[PDB]
Amino acid sequence: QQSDLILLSIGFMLFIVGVVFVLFTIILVKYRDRKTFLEVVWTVIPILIVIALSVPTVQTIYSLEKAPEATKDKEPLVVYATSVDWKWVFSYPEQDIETVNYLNIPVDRPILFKISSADSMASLWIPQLGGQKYAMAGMLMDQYLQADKVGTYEGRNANFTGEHFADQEFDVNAVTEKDFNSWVKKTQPKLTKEKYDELMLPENVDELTFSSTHLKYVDHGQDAEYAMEARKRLGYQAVSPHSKTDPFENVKKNEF
Amino acid sequence: XXXXXXXXXXXXXXXXXXXXXXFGFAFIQAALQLLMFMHMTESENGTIQVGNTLFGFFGAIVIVLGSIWI
Amino acid sequence: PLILGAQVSIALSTIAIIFVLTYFKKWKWLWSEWITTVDHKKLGIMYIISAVIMLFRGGVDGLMMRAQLALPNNSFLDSNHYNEIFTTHGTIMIIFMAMPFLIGLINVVVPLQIGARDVAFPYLNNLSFWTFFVGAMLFNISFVIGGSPNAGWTSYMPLASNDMSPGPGENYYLLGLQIAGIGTLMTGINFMVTILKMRTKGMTLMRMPMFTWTTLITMVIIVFAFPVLTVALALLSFDRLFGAHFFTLEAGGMPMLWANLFWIWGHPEVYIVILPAFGIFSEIISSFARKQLFGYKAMVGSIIAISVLSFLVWTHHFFTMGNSASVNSFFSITTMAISIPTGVKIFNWLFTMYKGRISFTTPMLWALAFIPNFVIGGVTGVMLAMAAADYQYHNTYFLVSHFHYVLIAGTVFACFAGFIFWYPKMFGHKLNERIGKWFFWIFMIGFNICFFPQYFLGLQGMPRRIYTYGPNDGWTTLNFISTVGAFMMGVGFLILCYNIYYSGVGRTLDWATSSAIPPHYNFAVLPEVKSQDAFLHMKEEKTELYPESKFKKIHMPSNSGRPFFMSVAFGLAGFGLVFEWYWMGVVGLIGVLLCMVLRSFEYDNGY
Amino acid sequence: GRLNILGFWIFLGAEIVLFSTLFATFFVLKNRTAGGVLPDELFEVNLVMIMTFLLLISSFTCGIAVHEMRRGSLKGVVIWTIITLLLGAGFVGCEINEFVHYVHEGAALSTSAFWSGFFVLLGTHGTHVTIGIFWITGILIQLKKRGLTPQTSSKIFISSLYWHFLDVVWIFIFTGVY
C-alpha cells in the first residue's frame, strides 16, 4: 500500500480537472444560445501537472528496486514462486519446505519473491501487498514484498486467460513470527519426485502440504522447457471440441 | 559517367567492413546507403520522398535500440 | 455447442436469402456499379456498412458478456465460451469496426473536402476494401466452421501455440488480420499521396482545414505502424503453422518478444483510431458554432507531436514484467509527455464554441457528450502512465474502465457523429432529429453506469477476464450496475436501426456540391478557395458557383474485376491455412499462386 | 507525370519499419541457442553475396541515369536491364544453396530460436529479391507492342528504385547478422 497514497492524492488531482471542465461549459453555453496569446501562456501549467508527478513517480520506480517497505537491511528471506496453469507453486530455499496454492508469511519480515511460471506467463498479484510483477517462463524475476499487518491477504493471478484461470485465487495468511517458527514446518509428506510432474496438469487441487523443496529439479526458473516433459510425458494435450478429459491415461489428484 | 564514381567508392566500404571484423562499425553501414540512394531522390517529388525515409530510419533506431533497451 | 448450432443455420439462411430475393440478376448492378467499383464515394459506404454489421455481431457479444457477468455463480457461459466471446468482441472492434468506420468516414469526406476527383490510386483502394473484407469473413467464419480464438485481442504467445491447444483458433486471428493489414497499409499509402499531390488550386497546406490534417496524420502512422503487424503476425504465423520458434516456450525462444512487436504496432495504431475521431469532431464543433478554429500554430503543431511521440511511449503497456526500472521511468515520463499534446486539443474546441452562436442538433449532441466522457477516461489513463502506481491497477477492470471511456466516447461517438452529420452525402434527406435524440440520451446515460462502477469494481478488487467474481465484500451490485448500464446501451441499437428504416451550417466543401448525393465526377470545376474556410467565403462573400461553358472532360478510371479476385485469393489462402492444414497448406499455396499471377496482371493492363 | 513514383516510394519507407521489426527480433534472439548449434557460416560466401549485390547496384545506379536520362539508349534496355536481371539470380541461387547446405545441422526454423530469425530476416529478404526479378522482367514485356519512351513508361523507374531499396538492408544485414 506504499503507492496507495499516490492513488488517493492523485484522485483529488483529477477530480479538480473533472470539475474544471464543468465550469468551462455549464457556466456559459446556456447563456449563449439563439433563444494566440492565451495558448502560449497555457504552456506553463501542463508540465506542472505532470512534472509534479514525473518526479515522485520516478522517485518511486527506483524505490521498489532496492530493499522496500520492510526490513531496512537485514533478515533476507527468499521464497521461490513458480506458477503452473491454474495452480500456484511456492518453495522455500531456507528449509526443505514446499507449498502450493497456499502461503504463510511473517509480518514485518522481508520476503524476496523469486517469480517464474512453467506453463503460461502469469504474475502473482496479491492485491493487499501492492506491486505485482510478471512470472516469465524462461527466467526468474526478483521481487520484494512484506506483509503490513497480521491478517488474511487475498492473493490472485493476473489471469492471462486460459480456460481454467479464474479460480487461481490462493488465499495467503500472514501471522506473527512466533507462530511462524513453530509453523516454518508444520512437520518438515516429502518431495515424491513424481507428484511434482503430477502438478503441471491444469485442473483443481486442495492444500497439499509437501515438506521438502523442489529446487533440485532444473531450477525451473531456468530452462522453461519443462512443459513438454510435463504434459506430454503423461500423455496429454488438450483440444477444443470433444475427446478431452486429459486424453486418457489417469493418475492424478483432483477434487471431490 | 557520374554514377560510376559512387559505385566504385561503395565497393571500398564493404571491403573495409570486412577489415573491421577480420558506433565505429554502425555508421559505415548507413553511410554506404547514403551514397547509394542520394543519386535518385531529389527533386520535384523530393523533400517528401527523401523526408519519408528520414523518420523511417528513426523508427528503425527506435525499434531496434528500443528492443535492446530492455 | 448448443447455441452455435442455431446460428450456423441462420448463417446458411442469410446466404440462402441473398440467392432468392436479391440474386434475380446481379451481373449488371452488383458486379458493375459495385463490388469492383472505383468511385471513392461507393467504397467508403461499403466500409461503414460493414462496421454497423460488426456492431451487431459485437453487440450481442458485449451484451451476453455482461449478462453473464450480472452476478456471481451465474451459469450463462462456461469457461471455453466466455474466453472466445470476449476475444471476438474486442477484435471485431478497433480492427473490423473502428478501422473500417473511420477509414469509411475518411474514404468519403476527405476526398470531397480537398476538391480532388478520386484518390491517388483508386484502383489499389478498391482491393484495399476487399483485402479487409476477406479478412473480416475469415475472422467471422471461425463461428461454427472452426473455432474463435480464446486468448484475447492481445493474444500473448505463451498461451497461443500448444499451451492454448485449439488448432483453428489463433490461426484466424493471425491470417485474418494479416490480410486486413495489407489493405489498411495501402489505405494509408493512398491517402498520404491523395492529400499531398491531388489538392485543388488555392488549398494551402497549413489550412485545409484541420480534419483533413488529422486524416493526414492518420495515414502517416499507418505507413510506419502496420508493417510491424505484418511481420508480428507473420512471425507468429510461422510459429503456429510452419513450425518456427520465435517466441515458443519449448525451444527457448523469448515469450515476451512477441509482446513488444505487437505494442510497437499497438499504441501507434491506438492513435490511428483516435486521430480521425478528433478530426471528425473538429469540423462539427466548428461548423454549427459558426466560428473559426482559433489556434493553428499550436494545434496542427500539436498534431505532429503525437505523430512522432507515439513510438516513444508504446512501452507503457508493460511496466508489470520486470524491466530495467530506468526504462520503466523513461516511458513513464514520456507517456506524461503525450497527454500534453493531446491535452491542448481539448482546450481548442471550447473557445471555438464560445462567443459564437450554437444550435443543439443531433450531431452536436455527439460532440457535446464527447468532451466530458473522453476526459473522464483521460483523467484515468494519466494514472496508468504512472509506472510506480501502474502495478496496483494493472488489468483489474480499472484498465478496462479507463479505455472504454476513451475509445467509445472518442471513436464510437465519432463513428456516430460522422454517421449522421454526413448522412445527406450518402442518400436523400437525413435522420429524424427528435427521435434521434432518444438514441443519444439512452446510449449516453447507460455508458456511464456501465464503466464508472467498473472504476469501483477494479479498485475494490475485480480482475479482468473472469467469468465469476464471488461474494467478496458485497461487491456484487457494482458488477450488476455495470451490467444494467451495459444492457442499457443495447437498448438503442434497435432505435438506431429503426431510424435507418426511413428509406445545415456547412463551412467546408461538404454541402458545396452541386446537390444532394454528389455525382461521380464530384465538382464540375475545382474551387479556387484561397482561404481557410471555403464555404463561408463562398456564400456571403460574393457567390462563386459552377458556371456553364467552363466544364471539360472526364477522368475515366473505370472498373477492373481483379481487386475482387485478388482478395479472394488472399481469403482462400488464409482460410486454407487456418481450418486444419497444420504443417502446410494444399490450397494455401494456390492463393499465393493466384495473387502473383494477378500481380503480373497489375503491370500488364494498359489504361 | 505519374504519382506512382511517390506513392510506391512511401511504401519503400514502410519496409524500413518492416525490416527494423525483423532486426529487432533478430538482435534480441541473438544470445539464445541454449540448446542447439552455434552459428558458424562461410565468410567468403558473405562477401561474394555482398560484392555481387554491390556490383548489382553499380550496374543499376548508372542503368537509368546514363540510360534514359542522359542521351537515349532505347536499344540498351535489352542490355542494361537484362544484365542486371541475371545478377538477381546470383543472389537467389547462392542463398538457396546456402539454405540447402544449412540442412546439415541447423535446418529451417525448428533447430533453434536463433535460426528462426536468420531464416526469416533472410526469408522475406529472399522473397523481396525474388519477386523483384519477376517485376523487372515483367516490364521487359513492353518493348514489343508498346515500347514507350522515358518520362512515360514509369514501370522501369518505380521498379528500379524498389530494386534499389533492397541493397539498403542487404548491407545492413551484412553488418547485422555477420
Ligand code: HEA
Ligand atoms: C471500440 C471499442 C469497444 C466497443 C465499441 C466495445 C463495446 C462494448 N463493450 Fe467491450 N471490449 C473492448 C472494447 C470495446 N468494447 C476491448 C478492447 C475488450 C478486450 C478485448 C480482449 O482482450 O479480448 C473488450 C471486452 C469487454 C469487457 C471486458 C471483459 C473483461 O475484462 O472481462 C467489457 C466489460 O463489461 C465489455 C462491455 C462492452 C459493452 C456493454 C459495449 C457496448 O458498446 C455494446 C455495444 C452494442 C451495440 C451498440 C448493439 C447492442 C446489441 C443488441 C441490442 C443485440 C441484442 C439482441 C439480442 C441479445 C438477441 N467489452
Ligand code: HEA
Ligand atoms: C483511442 C485509443 C487510445 C488513446 C487516445 C489512449 C490515450 C492514453 N492512454 Fe490508453 N489504452 C488504450 C487506448 C488508448 N489510450 C487501450 C486499447 C488500452 C488497453 C490495451 C489492452 O491491454 O488491451 C489502453 C491502456 C492504457 C495503458 C496501459 C495500462 C497497462 O499497462 O495495462 C496506459 C499507460 O500509460 C494508458 C494511458 C494513456 C494516456 C496517458 C493517454 C493520453 O493520450 C490521454 C490524453 C488525455 C488526457 C491527458 C486528459 C485530457 C487532458 C486534459 C484535460 C489537459 C489537462 C490534463 C493534465 C494536465 C493531466 N492507457
Ligand SMILES: [Cu+2]
Ligand atoms: Cu500505449
